[PDB]
Scaffold this active site. Structure first.
Site, PDB file in Angstrom:
ATOM      1  N   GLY A  45       0.857  -1.175  -0.046  1.00  0.00           N
ATOM      2  CA  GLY A  45      -0.038   0.272  -0.286  1.00  0.00           C
ATOM      3  C   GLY A  45       0.770   1.184  -0.040  1.00  0.00           C
ATOM      4  O   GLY A  45       1.932   1.305   0.678  1.00  0.00           O
ATOM      5  N   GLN A  50       3.612  10.092   0.537  1.00  0.00           N
ATOM      6  CA  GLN A  50       4.797   9.212   0.175  1.00  0.00           C
ATOM      7  C   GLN A  50       5.322   9.322  -1.209  1.00  0.00           C
ATOM      8  O   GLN A  50       6.351   9.289  -1.414  1.00  0.00           O
ATOM      9  CB  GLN A  50       4.383   7.734   0.561  1.00  0.00           C
ATOM     10  CG  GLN A  50       3.976   7.138   1.864  1.00  0.00           C
ATOM     11  CD  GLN A  50       3.963   5.673   2.055  1.00  0.00           C
ATOM     12  OE1 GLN A  50       3.109   4.972   1.661  1.00  0.00           O
ATOM     13  NE2 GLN A  50       4.658   5.234   3.146  1.00  0.00           N
ATOM     14  N   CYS A  90       7.877   1.576   5.930  1.00  0.00           N
ATOM     15  CA  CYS A  90       7.215   2.637   5.167  1.00  0.00           C
ATOM     16  C   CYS A  90       7.982   3.340   3.866  1.00  0.00           C
ATOM     17  O   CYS A  90       9.422   3.252   3.929  1.00  0.00           O
ATOM     18  CB  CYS A  90       6.857   4.123   6.108  1.00  0.00           C
ATOM     19  SG  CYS A  90       5.363   4.007   6.712  1.00  0.00           S
ATOM     20  N   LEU A  91       7.480   3.434   2.894  1.00  0.00           N
ATOM     21  CA  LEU A  91       8.081   3.715   1.387  1.00  0.00           C
ATOM     22  C   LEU A  91       9.130   4.976   1.540  1.00  0.00           C
ATOM     23  O   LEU A  91       9.907   5.032   0.983  1.00  0.00           O
ATOM     24  CB  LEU A  91       6.778   4.131   0.569  1.00  0.00           C
ATOM     25  CG  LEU A  91       6.026   2.917   0.029  1.00  0.00           C
ATOM     26  CD1 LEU A  91       6.887   1.948  -0.389  1.00  0.00           C
ATOM     27  CD2 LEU A  91       5.150   2.897   1.407  1.00  0.00           C
ATOM     28  N   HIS A 132      -3.562   3.528   8.144  1.00  0.00           N
ATOM     29  CA  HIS A 132      -2.206   3.781   8.145  1.00  0.00           C
ATOM     30  C   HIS A 132      -1.999   4.832   7.169  1.00  0.00           C
ATOM     31  O   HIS A 132      -1.594   5.740   7.492  1.00  0.00           O
ATOM     32  CB  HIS A 132      -1.210   2.590   7.956  1.00  0.00           C
ATOM     33  CG  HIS A 132       0.054   2.987   7.656  1.00  0.00           C
ATOM     34  ND1 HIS A 132       0.808   3.603   8.939  1.00  0.00           N
ATOM     35  CD2 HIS A 132       0.790   2.999   6.651  1.00  0.00           C
ATOM     36  CE1 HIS A 132       2.173   3.960   8.507  1.00  0.00           C
ATOM     37  NE2 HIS A 132       2.203   3.393   7.276  1.00  0.00           N
ATOM     38  N   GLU A 133      -2.519   4.558   5.897  1.00  0.00           N
ATOM     39  CA  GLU A 133      -2.377   5.623   4.777  1.00  0.00           C
ATOM     40  C   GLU A 133      -3.192   6.940   5.267  1.00  0.00           C
ATOM     41  O   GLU A 133      -2.421   7.891   4.909  1.00  0.00           O
ATOM     42  CB  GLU A 133      -2.921   5.091   3.498  1.00  0.00           C
ATOM     43  CG  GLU A 133      -2.421   3.602   3.017  1.00  0.00           C
ATOM     44  CD  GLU A 133      -0.761   3.752   3.194  1.00  0.00           C
ATOM     45  OE1 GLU A 133      -0.150   4.014   4.280  1.00  0.00           O
ATOM     46  OE2 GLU A 133      -0.038   3.430   1.965  1.00  0.00           O
ATOM     47  N   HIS A 136      -0.484   8.424   7.321  1.00  0.00           N
ATOM     48  CA  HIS A 136       0.576   8.854   6.774  1.00  0.00           C
ATOM     49  C   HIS A 136       0.642  10.008   5.811  1.00  0.00           C
ATOM     50  O   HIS A 136       1.204  11.014   6.079  1.00  0.00           O
ATOM     51  CB  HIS A 136       0.829   7.605   5.793  1.00  0.00           C
ATOM     52  CG  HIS A 136       2.720   7.363   5.422  1.00  0.00           C
ATOM     53  ND1 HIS A 136       3.222   8.436   4.890  1.00  0.00           N
ATOM     54  CD2 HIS A 136       3.072   6.387   5.793  1.00  0.00           C
ATOM     55  CE1 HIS A 136       4.597   7.666   4.925  1.00  0.00           C
ATOM     56  NE2 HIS A 136       4.385   6.574   5.354  1.00  0.00           N
TER      57      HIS A 136
HETATM   58  C1  LIG Z   1      -2.461   0.830   1.371  1.00  0.00           C
HETATM   59  C2  LIG Z   1      -1.517   0.814   2.407  1.00  0.00           C
HETATM   60  C3  LIG Z   1      -0.790  -0.316   2.815  1.00  0.00           C
HETATM   61  C4  LIG Z   1      -0.035  -0.618   4.118  1.00  0.00           C
HETATM   62  C5  LIG Z   1       1.252   0.364   3.760  1.00  0.00           C
HETATM   63  C6  LIG Z   1       2.453  -0.138   4.383  1.00  0.00           C
HETATM   64  C7  LIG Z   1       3.241   1.024   5.138  1.00  0.00           C
HETATM   65  C8  LIG Z   1       3.526   2.413   4.291  1.00  0.00           C
HETATM   66  O1  LIG Z   1       4.552   2.780   4.019  1.00  0.00           O
HETATM   67  N1  LIG Z   1       2.295   3.030   4.258  1.00  0.00           N
HETATM   68  O2  LIG Z   1       2.407   4.341   3.807  1.00  0.00           O
HETATM   69  C9  LIG Z   1       3.311  -0.918   3.396  1.00  0.00           C
HETATM   70  O3  LIG Z   1       3.044  -1.532   2.502  1.00  0.00           O
HETATM   71  N2  LIG Z   1       4.873  -1.320   3.891  1.00  0.00           N
HETATM   72  C10 LIG Z   1       5.582  -2.149   3.103  1.00  0.00           C
HETATM   73  C11 LIG Z   1       6.492  -3.148   3.801  1.00  0.00           C
HETATM   74  O4  LIG Z   1       7.319  -2.718   4.584  1.00  0.00           O
HETATM   75  N3  LIG Z   1       5.621  -4.115   4.631  1.00  0.00           N
HETATM   76  C12 LIG Z   1       6.086  -5.491   4.242  1.00  0.00           C
HETATM   77  C13 LIG Z   1       4.988  -6.384   4.686  1.00  0.00           C
HETATM   78  C14 LIG Z   1       3.833  -5.641   4.372  1.00  0.00           C
HETATM   79  C15 LIG Z   1       4.133  -4.337   4.547  1.00  0.00           C
HETATM   80  C16 LIG Z   1       3.911  -3.722   6.188  1.00  0.00           C
HETATM   81  O5  LIG Z   1       4.575  -4.461   6.839  1.00  0.00           O
HETATM   82  C17 LIG Z   1       6.552  -1.153   2.330  1.00  0.00           C
HETATM   83  C18 LIG Z   1       7.376  -1.820   1.199  1.00  0.00           C
HETATM   84  C19 LIG Z   1       5.583  -0.081   1.771  1.00  0.00           C
HETATM   85 ZN   LIG Z   2       3.845   4.158   5.586  1.00  0.00          ZN
END
Ligand SMILES: CCCCC[C@H](CC(=O)NO)C(=O)N[C@H](C(=O)N1CCC[C@H]1CO)C(C)C
Ligand SMILES: [Zn+2]
Length: 147
Positions: A45, A50, A90-91, A132-133, A136
């Site tokens: 997500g 971000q 987080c991105l 979370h978004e 964020h």
């Molecule tokens: C629609 C929003 C979905 C949640 C987003 C989250 C965290 C984030 O950066 N939100 O802005 C994300 O995907 N985190 C990822 C990641 O670190 N992990 C790996 C497992 C899934 C996720 C959260 O732990 C990163 C690569 C962006």
């Molecule tokens: Zn994030």
């Protein structure tokens, strides 16, 4: 097809996003790249801030079914319940995933990348990510409560 992703520290990630009154073709490009990026980041997500857009635009990639492909524009929280905590990154952050506390289930209103605002109920990973978004993009970040 990744746009310009902002990284922590960054004012825009900590910046409050504003939910636009109407989905513009400019706004549509923003989301379109948001997923394009988020996926390119292999993120489940991506939140507007971000990807460098100071507008409350959220894109989801949480496999709540067969194929991941969630998009919401200017989402707002309607209800939250239960207290969860799960590690995530987080991105904006260099993949530094930490366990953040959020509600277990939450129902929120948003519009799709197509331009139709509807209300959707999110639970678990959906509820967590979507909420979370919201945080964020409203410049609030989980790190704000980490220690
Ligand atoms: C629609 C929003 C979905 C949640 C987003 C989250 C965290 C984030 O950066 N939100 O802005 C994300 O995907 N985190 C990822 C990641 O670190 N992990 C790996 C497992 C899934 C996720 C959260 O732990 C990163 C690569 C962006
Ligand atoms: Zn994030």
């Amino acid at each position: 097809s990744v746009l310009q992703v902002l990284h922590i520290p960054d004012e825009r990630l900590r910046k409050v996003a504003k939910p636009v009154e109407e989905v513009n073709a400019e706004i549509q490009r923003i989301v379109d790249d948001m997923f394009e990026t988020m996926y390119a980041e292999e993120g489940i997500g991506l939140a507007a801030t971000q990807v460098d857009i100071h507008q409350r635009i959220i894109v989801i990639d949480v496999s709540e079914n067969r194929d991941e492909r969630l998009v919401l524009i200017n989402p707002e929280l309607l209800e939250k319940s239960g207290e969860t905590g799960i590690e995530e990154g987080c991105l904006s952050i260099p993949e530094q995933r930490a366990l953040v506390p959020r509600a277990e289930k939450v129902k929120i209103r948003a519009l799709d990348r197509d331009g139709k605002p509807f209300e959707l109920e999110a639970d678990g990973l959906l509820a967590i990510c979507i909420q979370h978004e919201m945080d964020h993009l409203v410049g609030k970040l989980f790190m704000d409560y980490l220690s």
